[PDB]
Design a protein around this ligand. Structure first.
Ligand code: A1CD7
Lengths: 514, 514
């Protein structure tokens, strides 16, 4: 094929783009001794599918007369290779002077102009923050199709970051809503020992405290086994039936490999998107024995025409005349059979939406009349950024909206792994949009009687009962009965006071009698 | 001018002369952030003067770099703000333009090495860029452990022990005095969260219990306190006042603590042991609040004092200026005189390390150096290999890029006639041991060691029963007749006497009687 050569085309305004087109080989994790970029020869299909989605979006934005009338919109895509070292070089290249290959260190920029209008940002959170420092210092719009990391919401440190996917807080608030609505006020929480899970645990702990949900136990599991044994042992010791597992895919696979080694006890697992959708964990045998698995996945429209688009272009990308029209190696050797599995990928929409949003934001910034834009000097990024904070844009339908936090208002579906045979069937059992609507009669539990499994504690007690706290935040009590032959002298205290030799009382009594 | 000195090879110097925890990170009206309006900090100017003194020595001493002028250019980096532009200014090719290339092996940067920022966040942000060019970076005061991953930060080295050793010093100090029940305060920023998590892990592993963890508001001394912040501080200090714990470990920037200690003074509080982390352990400004004498005793963790000769008298393009710095330092000069150079040694050793590495790279004899173009990656390559004695100490770089220097535990003193930060113990990171604890003075009535512990040690014949979540809390209960506490095997339960023997209450023995 001649396909790498298509990762660039000219336009009056240029969009930069970052994707994980390639990846390092394990022996390719070389200790650099001369300052040059790692050559990521190894291919990866997800990035190419996302890049094709961007090409399709830009093609549509050019075709429609209703947007940017009279202007041609171009793109310029680079590989990230999922590492800061590789990602930072094209990050610098984007902000180079228009018509030049240099980045300038001036102390004021009032009439500086970089070669790209805005950047479709990287997928992973680490790259998102690393490049966010740079892009938000210059006040250049960055719009990410991934990077759910909640830390990016901070406008004190990431003024120009936007994303077309919900952040972690929406999913975790949905999980808290699930626990609250089902009445499971007593739970345990686990996370992966990476910034993702370690931030998720903080968010969820604060949310649980705010809503009166009590956390029995907290822990983190390593990424690639003593701590795994400790974590599952403590979970079993905690006397809990509901466990949240906000873990990356490999950490979940490690924990569930340990569970495969011995299923010490079954429990209701509240999953997360990454685990809830990743094959290598879903393939583990007999997982129905673990107890039911629940979790929220965000729902958006498919790109219906995308598979035909990829078919068409991979057919076209070898015509001997069309080739006349190497930032990715091995991109030119690909065949549709290795690409097919990802044509239905849900995240492509988030790429598409991002492009449209930027286009819409430009259309508003130019104040284009639908018959043609007015004459102006080039729009600078910081002009576009000011308009973009309050932006409503259609994406084929389903109009979305950015707000001050940089997130989009989007809704979630509650998915249940209804186990049949060796296969978990993903079953919808409710929706969340800021309030939770549950179709409770449809879920069948792992417990034989199919009644709701119970995970709760008391926070109230007849006054004749002890008040020894329990739980990680001391949000539960034991209610143990005050002894006969004693009286409950202090409300809400621990102790009880005993009576005379001829003095008798019932249990839970506040008094004694002759 | 003060901030620039020409030479044949130039060092980039980054210090935080002005700081504000709420500073703006992005451009203001497309001019680079200007720090002159933030609060000036004395100790940062002291460290900058330390760098200038080191280069003065190296230029005077013909034994080390004969005929080679060593120059410097210094730029103010103000906490987070102004992170990016100084890096580009260091990397630009003398007309403030930096060309983008696929290879930088032959690129002559404006500086050959960077004496890096004092803040962990700034260190990581700058390292993200300097990793591309492999431009050697040495940081003198950034302690966060994240910096040990040389696959992540290949270009970065340090001249101060990592956070692990600080936490170890604190833990061993607390163990030596057999404290068991401690309070932790953090400043609601990443430094506090990092060190709090690390301390939690170490303490939990070592049998001490954190009774209490709490977050301070990010107040500022120049700014008027709001009612809500006042209520928050009142809540915090009330929590401390009513609790039994009296060891208080504080992780905070010094700016944040002024209002906190003023509020503590309003509360008529007394009797605590303040374990001060490095970020404030040696602050001259806080020390001059002489009323603090009534809040207990102040012990801080710091790097070992080494008396620099001659430096005491030496102390007598945007963002390269500070007007108030000298006026501020002039007042504190006496207090600074008594306080032996501590972090100044980190700066001094960093500059000397670069000097020796360059001397070796040129293959220079102590008669002449064959001058040649130096590319930063070669200087990094040589920096990794140095080993030399400096002022009765010795510096060489570990595999993790750290340098071994003695840590020191210091008590604040207010006599003003001698050293205000008395040495009381020293921690050797190579041996991982706290050593040679000297005569601390206490607020107690007859200098008997104070303590805070959850539960007093039980009498003989009394078994333990855990009170709650913390292992450190236990009730004492006497063994029943016919049972005894085999303390050699268990502490939480009493074993029955042989079938021919019996025991009293609260007894470890058994005897042959009915
Ligand atoms: C995010 O951390 C922090 O904000 C704090 C406090 C801080 C705020 C603003 C500017 C500097 C420091 N950092 C530290 O204490 C770092 C550890 C790390 O940052 O890894 N050790 C510095 C010890 C010598 C020191 C040098 C400069 C000083 O003022 C200009 C100063 O007071 C103390």
């Amino acid at each position: 094929l001649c396909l790498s050569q298509q990762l660039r085309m000219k336009g009056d305004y240029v969009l930069g783009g970052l994707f994980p087109l390639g990846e390092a080989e394990e022996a390719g994790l070389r200790s650099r001794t001369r300052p040059s970029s790692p050559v990521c020869t190894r291919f990866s299909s997800n990035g190419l599918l996302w890049a094709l989605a961007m090409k399709m979006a830009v093609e549509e934005i050019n075709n429609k007369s209703d947007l940017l009338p009279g202007l041609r919109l171009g793109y310029d895509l680079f590989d990230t290779c999922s590492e800061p070292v590789v990602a930072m070089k094209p990050s610098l290249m984007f902000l180079a002077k228009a018509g030049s290959r240099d980045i300038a260190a001036y102390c004021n920029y009032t009439q500086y102009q970089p070669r790209v209008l805005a950047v479709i940002g990287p997928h992973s959170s680490e790259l998102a923050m690393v490049t966010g420092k740079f892009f938000s210092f210059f006040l250049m719009p960055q719009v990410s199709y991934g990077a759910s990391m909640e830390l990016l919401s901070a406008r004190e440190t990431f003024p120009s970051f936007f994303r077309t996917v919900p952040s972690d807080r929406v999913q975790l608030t949905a999980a808290a809503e699930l626990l609250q609505e089902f009445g499971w006020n007593w739970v345990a929480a686990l996370g992966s020992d990476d910034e993702y899970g370690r931030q998720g645990l903080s968010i969820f702990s604060a949310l649980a405290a705010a809503r009166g949900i009590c956390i029995a136990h907290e822990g983190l599991v390593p990424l690639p086994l003593g701590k795994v044994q400790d974590v599952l042992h403590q979970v079993n010791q905690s006397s809990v039936q509901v466990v949240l597992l906000f873990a990356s895919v490999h950490a979940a696979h490690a924990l569930f490999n340990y569970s495969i080694s011995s299923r010490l006890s079954p429990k209701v697992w509240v999953a997360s998107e990454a685990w809830l959708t990743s094959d290598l964990v879903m393939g583990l045998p007999g997982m129905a024995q673990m107890g039911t698995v629940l979790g929220f996945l965000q729902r958006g429209a498919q790109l219906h025409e995308f598979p035909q688009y990829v078919k068409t272009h991979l057919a076209l990308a070898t015509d001997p005349a069309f080739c006349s029209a190497q930032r990715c190696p091995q991109c030119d050797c690909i065949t549709l059979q290795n690409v097919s599995a990802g044509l239905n990928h849900h995240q492509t929409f988030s790429v598409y939406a991002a492009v449209y949003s930027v286009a819409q934001a430009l259309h508003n910034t130019l104040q284009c009349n639908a018959s043609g834009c007015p004459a102006q000097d080039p729009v600078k990024p910081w002009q576009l950024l000011e308009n973009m904070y309050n932006l409503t844009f259609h994406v084929g339908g389903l109009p979305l909206r950015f707000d001050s936090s940089g997130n989009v208002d989007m809704e979630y579906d509650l998915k249940l792994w209804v186990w049949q045979g060796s296969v978990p069937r993903l079953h919808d059992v409710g929706r969340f949009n800021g309030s939770l609507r549950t179709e409770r009669l449809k879920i069948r539990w792992h417990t034989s009687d199919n009644q709701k499994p119970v995970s709760r504690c008391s926070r109230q007690c007849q006054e004749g009962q002890v008040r020894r706290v329990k739980g990680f935040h001391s949000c539960c009590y034991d209610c143990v009965d005050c002894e006969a032959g004693s009286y409950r002298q202090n409300p809400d205290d621990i102790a009880c006071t005993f009576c005379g030799q001829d003095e008798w009382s019932p249990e839970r009594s506040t008094r004694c009698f002759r | 001018s003060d901030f620039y000195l020409p030479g044949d090879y130039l060092l980039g110097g980054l210090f935080s002369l002005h700081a504000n925890m709420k500073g703006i990170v992005h451009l203001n009206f497309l001019q680079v952030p200007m720090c002159k309006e933030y609060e000036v900090k004395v100790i940062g100017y002291n460290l900058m003067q330390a760098m200038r003194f080191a280069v003065e020595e190296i230029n005077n001493d013909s034994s080390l770099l004969p005929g080679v002028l060593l120059g410097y250019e210094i730029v103010d980096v103000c906490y987070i703000s102004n992170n990016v532009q100084p890096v580009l200014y260091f990397l630009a090719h003398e007309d403030n333009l930096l060309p983008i290339q696929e290879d930088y092996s032959n690129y002559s940067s404006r500086v050959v090495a960077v004496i890096g920022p004092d803040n962990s966040e700034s260190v990581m942000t700058v390292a993200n860029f300097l990793s591309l060019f492999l431009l050697p970076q040495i940081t003198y005061s950034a302690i966060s452990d994240e910096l040990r991953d040389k696959v992540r930060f290949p270009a970065l080295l340090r001249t101060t022990p990592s956070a692990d050793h600080h936490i170890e010093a604190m833990v061993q100090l607390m163990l030596h005095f057999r404290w068991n029940w401690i309070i932790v305060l953090v400043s609601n920023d990443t430094y506090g969260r990092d060190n709090g998590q690390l301390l939690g892990e170490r303490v939990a592993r070592r049998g001490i219990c954190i009774a209490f963890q709490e977050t301070l508001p990010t107040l500022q001394p120049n700014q008027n306190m709001t009612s809500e912040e006042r209520q928050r501080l009142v809540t915090i200090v009330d929590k401390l006042q009513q609790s039994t714990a009296r060891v208080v470990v504080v992780f905070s920037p010094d700016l944040t603590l002024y209002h906190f200690f003023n509020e503590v003074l309003r509360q008529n509080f007394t009797g605590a042991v303040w374990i001060a982390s490095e970020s404030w352990a040696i602050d001259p400004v806080l020390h001059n609040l002489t009323e603090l004498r009534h809040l207990g005793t102040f012990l801080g963790i710091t790097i070992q004092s080494v008396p620099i000769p001659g430096f005491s008298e030496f102390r007598e393009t945007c963002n390269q200026e500070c007007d108030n710095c000298l006026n501020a330092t002039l007042s504190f000069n006496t207090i600074l005189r008594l306080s032996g150079e501590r972090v100044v040694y980190s700066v001094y050793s960093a500059v000397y390390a670069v000097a020796h590495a360059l001397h070796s790279l040129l293959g220079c004899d102590k008669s002449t150096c064959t001058k040649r173009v130096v590319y930063p990656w070669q200087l990094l390559e040589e920096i990794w290999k140095v080993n030399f004695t400096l002022l009765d100490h010795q510096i060489f770089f570990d595999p993790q890029g750290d340098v071994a220097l003695h840590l020191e535990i210091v008590q604040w003193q207010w006599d003003r006639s001698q050293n205000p930060f008395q040495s009381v113990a020293s921690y050797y990171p190579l041996q991982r041991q706290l050593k040679n604890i000297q005569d601390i003075s206490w607020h107690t009535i007859n200098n008997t060691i104070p303590m805070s512990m959850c539960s007093k040690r039980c009498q003989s014949g009394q078994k333990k029963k855990p009170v709650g979540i913390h292992v450190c809390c236990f009730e004492c209960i006497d063994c029943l007749p016919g049972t005894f506490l085999n303390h050699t095997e268990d502490e939480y339960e009493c074993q029955a006497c042989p079938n021919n023997e019996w025991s009293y209450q609260s007894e470890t023995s058994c005897f042959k009687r009915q």
